[PDB]
């Protein structure tokens, strides 16, 4: 979950490589998108949109292993400057768009890297962010130009508890090289099932494999499966995506002048041709 | 971040023609 | 109109020029005032302006600090390097890559020998040409995009 | 928040007006 | 790292030119010559 | 006043110069696309201009380059403009060249009296890409420092020499301060010159042979 | 977009106007 | 029915004009580019620095930088300005003929210029040699951890009339 | 009584020769100039460095650089070589198709290459993806304060035959 | 074999080129000293050569310049030679120019048909000294950092502008990293180019007018 | 001998050339093989060699680290800067220096107008010239050395 | 004296400026010269010569103020590498030249900056230094090329005791502004004379000026001399000089090859001309 | 800082040239012309 | 310690042999 | 450090002549 | 010095020799 990025990597959620630490636990793999505008003007509210899609009609395993639907979260870094715009600067139709959403700042004062989720998949399908652009004229040290935005969004449950031990959304391999005898199946009247399993004979050998309830099996009885061999099928239907994009804190005077200069040019070009036209004429008062 | 590329292309291409005809026509409106 | 003056097919020089492939700037509109001095500035000042505008609406970004221990994932030369890139990256014996790349410049030289057989400018009277040109061009664009895609999904461009 | 648009626009206009003017200028391709 | 609006711009004109280029190989393939060759 | 013209004329002979200019004629088949060359040119000079401009602020050293850039970006008067131009103008240039490569080929402009004018072209082109490449790394940021780290290996395939080549152009075994050094050299002094020689070839040859035939 | 368009139109518009506008303008006071 | 000189001439200036515009247009930001960014267009003068160009702890400074303090500061606008509880003014250590940093001479209560042989005071204020103008002066108050150097408008508590710097 | 071709021709080669000498003469040190100075033509391989490119205290290294040590060293000839009481060999962290530094993945006991998707071992030694050659290996003994990195001649305790580096 | 010559000749016209060369004659009064020009030239190209050479090792930053020099001096292959040359060749060059300025003047080579060829000369000369000066400081050692600190003030006399000028060419108020930056620019990209334009003038004008009269 | 071909005082062109100050490379030894291709390389390769040798016997030293708080005492631009230096340093109103310096380039221009009055190349038929040249030249060398000397002892060059 | 450079400035005897601290006490002013060869070969003995001249037939004041003749010293820094060559590598005629001389190393291990003196003026008029050049082939970190040498030499007694108080080789000014009454003259049966002096009347005023025996006076009785006014004449006839020079640790292979290349060139040049000579001929088989 | 062997070199040739230069203004001032002017 | 001399010498010899050869070459000033 | 400058000058100058005559003479020894 | 001289002499010497030496040498086997 979002907050555990926080909790295992404290200072930034994004590796030098571009990684994004989320990733680190969420080992699956699925499309993710941010849209922002192309330019925002200094000091405005604009929408910036995380898309984290999936087949809404589908469910993943839970702890015990029910088969409940699933939940999204993401982290979104906008550029130095950017913040979640003020409740009262959001105007209305946007306020509705944005929804019940818990925007949290990655660390105290990184007001521009925002955590989001868990938040439930069915309607948080995209996820809006009311964001308020900086002002290079009152923040002497915000500068105009174009800046990155890395998204890095995820849906469905993880593969590793911050503590270090496997979850159960994943597949469970094989403790041993060789031949199997018993596929047992505990259930200690609190922490649910446990299909256990054993292997043996070849190297002296007696040793065991407890495997949580969630996956299907695909294994049968007696197999000669070698160590760490696919014994479980694959529970996950969720996983992690990344995005990067570019937005442009545009000062308008630049545009304004530029526009001017575009006219000035149009206008000369006109003069030029016009001109040649007058000479296309005087020119023919000389072939006779 | 793909809706531009597309956009770009259309205009980049199509405008030529506008300018083209714009030219052409200008040309008609004058006599040769 | 325009303005225009015709060849001078009495000038035995223009002739022998024409003949060696070449008198072609001796007839047509005059290039003084005319082309150079009126419309050129239009092309320039035009060309300028687009870049100016291009630059101002979408100016030029700043990367992170390069780090020699972290490779970016997403890391692409610029555009007119895709084609080669594709080749280079996905052709798994290294000397073939080089070989194949140099072939671009080299080949591209040869052409006007190779294509020197007939005298024909027009891309129409040169079907076998215009074809190989077309073909090449595509394979180009294709490897092109191809470099934008991810390895495996690359050649297929994803669609087979 | 649409001087911004005028903006791209103007990029398009010159781009056009150019070709335009170029062709008009030499009765052109 | 990658720059759509450019790339668009590129194909856009690559076709356009490719285009009009043959448009005039034709337009002339085909009402040819005059004044002498 | 004093009659300036004549002044020159007595001495230098301004006059023939003017005639060589005014007497070059434009034929018929020469249609818009035969502006690509010139465009590519205009393109480049814009580079050269802004090129030089940034040579007054940019610092080619691995402690300094990356930041001077963002100086030019953030605190130099119009650096943002100036640098932004150099950036799109590079692109524009590589591309107007390709577009000109088209009008040459499908106009069969590259044929018998003129296979030199084409040969150069290729060279121009290899050089332009080169500017292009080297350029590209001087920011000594993440994206460009992986692209030198990438290509600079490529030649190592090539079998007697080929390392020596890489070593040549990276200035040691790994990438690093020599590389950038060498590269700034590259980019700001070698290619500016080479290009100019061959542009000069590419141009004379043309004033000499005139445009290619009609269609 | 739609406003792109409009703005566009309206922009070329004008210039196109000022062109024609000025031939005549120039033309019929005998300048072309 | 052709147009006369002064109308090819109108048209000429008409274009060549607008052209010129477009040009000076572009010319202009190019020119400003090339003029240097001015250090910080806020107050008048900056916080004063050492060799490395660091910032100077006003407590490590006194506890230890050479007997009755005659000492080198990287001050106003670059100029290493002499700095001498601290003193009112800064002496502005560059000579006033050519411009070599000039030295304190403890056994003379004078500055020399070597390159060429001018001399000054306790205070700046010349008194010999090719150099036609006192050394420079400027206040050195003492904000938070450090010193602070702001120019010297007040007329010259040492000449009578205007400072030559202002 | 004039000299014939092949004697204007003797004389020609006679000079043009010596000329050529003088030329290659000069040419020569120019060429060596431009080949890079080789790091240190003494032993085989250098003392191993961090980011800043410093030198690494072998006591601050273990006391603290990440659980069961998978860690980035600026080693041989530039190459950041993975370093993992310390281990025999260095793993030579550059991938062997294109050449991006490749990462340890603790929850897989594999290295990936991302740019493109190759994989390796505990040991280097490939096992998937476009890359046709184990990662690199090299000894990391431990002289005075620090580590020391010298190449790996001995044949590949992991392949059987010759290393591809030698 | 294939007859190469003709190849060219059909196309380019190599042949006239050769005739323009072989037909230029040498008169009588042209005596040893009329080698000064050429010498000055040879001089300069030696600069340009070695110039470029050091652009591959020298680092224009106030932490780095001074030392890279002594790198080139101490550890680069023949740097000592190469740098040592650039050094004496600069001197030789400034001086062969002065010596050529003599043979012009006391040969009255600078007179009516040819006051352009002299005007340039001066410009060449102002540029050469400029290379000269800027050059001179790039070591960012004691002697040269006092000589920029010295001249760079000089213009401040000049009354409306004159500071702005200094400020222009020192890139701020004091000397310092901008100065060196600017200067490396100077020295390795502006003057190399200017010089070449005007050398080009200075040369054409001469191929055009031929040598000055006899005595 | 040498080799030599005389003017062609029938060529009405050479004439009108001669006449406008100027046919001078139409007669004498030929410049091909002859001058260009045989003795030139001697001048070059010669010029080279001296510098080479110069460079190798007395190569190129390394200064101390520049220090912006210590002025060197002994601190001199290079040689062909002495003259101006002298002027500059010892002329005590600053604008005069500049003024006076620029005068070098500027003046030096003017000359060939100024000296344009007569047509006379030879330094002999131009006494008033050759004098001012001589004079100037000395004052030059003199201020020259003068900059090597110490201020006061400068003008006098020590000897009055 | 030499050793007090040592004792007041410990780490180097030469200031950033180029000064040389000697100077600092020795305030007078006189010519000084070092000669070394132009090149030394690596590893040799060569002479390097300090000249510290003066009018041998002349004397300066002493403590008490006799009027004994005077003594020289100098400090001489050669380049990193350089040392005083070994007793047995000096050969003979040089050993005599060099004399009884106490070469001392400025600080432990600056073996290449050498103190010298006091040493008496009459015969130490120049001062030889047997110096042994470095070897770039055994000292991997000595490099060939050309290096500086600063001299910085002095003759006659100083003006300031390391302690800080005036000596008596100098002149004694004036303690006060105004009018004088008594030119006394003590002599406490150990530290000799003391012509004292007083000033007074104008400002209230009573105050005193003790002035050591050495100078002449030039003052008479009653004067109206203003404060710090020339009251004493100038005792010193000694003082300090500086030199800098350049020497070239030459590797000989450089020379050797260079020489070669000089031949190679001579030799082509010859070929060239020769050649033209042959064409100067064939040329004249064509004017007939 | 200052460089004798150069400076020597400079005057040395400055005179030499100055020299021979007038030597030939003369040598020719004074057996002039021929072949036509 | 006089290869060193040969050294300067050679500087002088080329310097000479040059002029020499140059004059010989064009019978010269 | 002044005995060079002088030296220099003498040779720099005087040698020219040696070379000069050396030339001249060579020239005599050959015939024209 | 004196040895400068000698060496000098002896050096030019030789070349001068090889010159003359080679004219004839070349000359009288009909090459000039
Ligand atoms: C906002 C509004 C602003 C408006 C205006 C602003 C500014 C206006 C000032 C500019 C007007 C100048 C008029 C010049 C044209 C003229 O009179 O015709 C005479 C000639 C040619 O007539 C030519 O034009 C022809 C014919 S015709 O008369 O039109 O018929 C001709 O037949 C063609 O052959 C050709 O020879 O002038 C030219 O137009 C060609 C040269 C132009 C220039 C230069 C290039 C580059 C750099 C330049 C700079 C100058 C530097 C100066 C320095 C310190
Ligand atoms: C240690 C000892 C070493 C000894 C030797 C070493 C090396 C020897 C190899 C060199 C010999 C080549 C002979 C060429 C001369 C010839 O045959 O005459 C034919 C022509 C001209 O005859 C000319 O000379 C003339 C006449 S005559 O025959 O002498 O009479 C003529 O009349 C004159 O007009 C002119 O046209 O050759 C030339 O001499 C002129 C061109 C020279 C070259 C080039 C310049 C620059 C760069 C060049 C390089 C090449 C690159 C190659 C590439 C990959
Ligand atoms: S600068 Fe002060 S005296 Fe020369
Ligand atoms: S580099 Fe290892 S997979 Fe592309």
Tab-separated table of N, CA and C in Angstrom, chain F residues 11-49:
chain	number	residue	atom	x	y	z
F	11	UNK	N	39.140	48.958	-58.664
F	11	UNK	CA	39.986	48.006	-57.832
F	11	UNK	C	39.695	46.497	-57.819
F	12	UNK	N	38.653	46.246	-57.031
F	12	UNK	CA	38.074	44.935	-56.943
F	12	UNK	C	37.250	44.406	-58.111
F	13	UNK	N	36.348	45.194	-58.730
F	13	UNK	CA	35.595	44.583	-59.873
F	13	UNK	C	34.248	43.940	-59.503
F	14	UNK	N	33.639	44.645	-58.558
F	14	UNK	CA	32.400	44.360	-57.951
F	14	UNK	C	31.488	43.915	-59.002
F	15	UNK	N	31.675	44.563	-60.130
F	15	UNK	CA	30.675	44.405	-61.160
F	15	UNK	C	30.511	42.975	-61.645
F	16	UNK	N	31.531	42.122	-61.616
F	16	UNK	CA	31.314	40.878	-62.319
F	16	UNK	C	30.597	39.977	-61.388
F	17	UNK	N	31.036	40.099	-60.149
F	17	UNK	CA	30.340	39.522	-59.058
F	17	UNK	C	28.886	39.760	-59.330
F	18	UNK	N	28.467	41.013	-59.562
F	18	UNK	CA	26.992	41.202	-59.612
F	18	UNK	C	26.317	40.457	-60.755
F	19	UNK	N	26.902	40.553	-61.921
F	19	UNK	CA	26.576	39.685	-63.015
F	19	UNK	C	26.670	38.207	-62.721
F	20	UNK	N	27.832	37.604	-62.361
F	20	UNK	CA	27.584	36.207	-61.905
F	20	UNK	C	26.275	36.046	-61.098
F	21	UNK	N	25.993	36.774	-60.027
F	21	UNK	CA	24.619	36.656	-59.464
F	21	UNK	C	23.440	36.737	-60.461
F	22	UNK	N	23.350	37.831	-61.248
F	22	UNK	CA	22.096	38.205	-61.933
F	22	UNK	C	22.109	37.697	-63.324
F	23	UNK	N	21.747	36.444	-63.524
F	23	UNK	CA	22.028	35.859	-64.832
F	23	UNK	C	21.876	34.421	-64.591
F	24	UNK	N	21.843	34.083	-63.310
F	24	UNK	CA	21.562	32.729	-62.926
F	24	UNK	C	20.034	32.903	-63.141
F	25	UNK	N	19.432	31.910	-63.826
F	25	UNK	CA	17.969	31.865	-64.057
F	25	UNK	C	17.268	30.696	-63.410
F	26	UNK	N	15.988	30.913	-63.076
F	26	UNK	CA	15.258	29.752	-62.573
F	26	UNK	C	14.237	29.032	-63.538
F	27	UNK	N	14.554	27.759	-63.891
F	27	UNK	CA	13.687	27.063	-64.771
F	27	UNK	C	12.482	26.472	-64.007
F	28	UNK	N	11.288	26.535	-64.689
F	28	UNK	CA	10.236	25.616	-64.781
F	28	UNK	C	10.128	24.530	-63.777
F	29	UNK	N	10.905	23.474	-63.903
F	29	UNK	CA	10.610	22.341	-63.048
F	29	UNK	C	10.936	22.642	-61.607
F	30	UNK	N	11.602	23.767	-61.358
F	30	UNK	CA	12.093	23.984	-59.990
F	30	UNK	C	10.957	24.534	-59.212
F	31	UNK	N	10.540	23.678	-58.307
F	31	UNK	CA	9.248	23.837	-57.764
F	31	UNK	C	9.517	23.886	-56.255
F	32	UNK	N	8.554	24.318	-55.403
F	32	UNK	CA	8.807	24.345	-53.905
F	32	UNK	C	9.897	23.475	-53.208
F	33	UNK	N	9.872	22.163	-53.405
F	33	UNK	CA	10.812	21.248	-52.707
F	33	UNK	C	12.321	21.521	-52.811
F	34	UNK	N	12.685	22.099	-53.944
F	34	UNK	CA	13.978	22.674	-54.242
F	34	UNK	C	14.140	23.927	-53.271
F	35	UNK	N	13.254	24.060	-52.302
F	35	UNK	CA	13.664	24.892	-51.211
F	35	UNK	C	14.204	24.072	-50.004
F	36	UNK	N	14.001	22.774	-49.979
F	36	UNK	CA	14.609	22.060	-48.866
F	36	UNK	C	16.112	22.413	-48.524
F	37	UNK	N	16.981	22.513	-49.539
F	37	UNK	CA	18.455	22.717	-49.309
F	37	UNK	C	18.657	23.871	-48.368
F	38	UNK	N	18.130	24.966	-48.928
F	38	UNK	CA	18.125	26.312	-48.349
F	38	UNK	C	17.471	26.201	-47.005
F	39	UNK	N	16.419	25.408	-46.933
F	39	UNK	CA	15.853	25.365	-45.623
F	39	UNK	C	16.783	24.759	-44.570
F	40	UNK	N	17.303	23.576	-44.923
F	40	UNK	CA	18.364	22.926	-44.169
F	40	UNK	C	19.463	23.903	-43.859
F	41	UNK	N	19.937	24.621	-44.881
F	41	UNK	CA	20.908	25.665	-44.562
F	41	UNK	C	20.464	26.651	-43.429
F	42	UNK	N	19.328	27.330	-43.656
F	42	UNK	CA	18.747	28.323	-42.748
F	42	UNK	C	18.693	27.659	-41.400
F	43	UNK	N	17.864	26.627	-41.242
F	43	UNK	CA	18.126	25.662	-40.122
F	43	UNK	C	19.528	25.644	-39.434
F	44	UNK	N	20.555	25.160	-40.155
F	44	UNK	CA	21.904	25.165	-39.599
F	44	UNK	C	22.406	26.564	-39.089
F	45	UNK	N	22.193	27.648	-39.834
F	45	UNK	CA	22.823	28.904	-39.436
F	45	UNK	C	22.278	29.348	-38.114
F	46	UNK	N	20.955	29.241	-37.925
F	46	UNK	CA	20.252	29.263	-36.650
F	46	UNK	C	21.007	28.400	-35.684
F	47	UNK	N	21.305	27.154	-35.960
F	47	UNK	CA	22.205	26.504	-35.048
F	47	UNK	C	23.468	27.267	-34.701
F	48	UNK	N	24.311	27.491	-35.714
F	48	UNK	CA	25.558	28.196	-35.551
F	48	UNK	C	25.370	29.449	-34.682
F	49	UNK	N	24.286	30.188	-34.860
F	49	UNK	CA	24.074	31.422	-34.118
F	49	UNK	C	23.933	31.162	-32.660
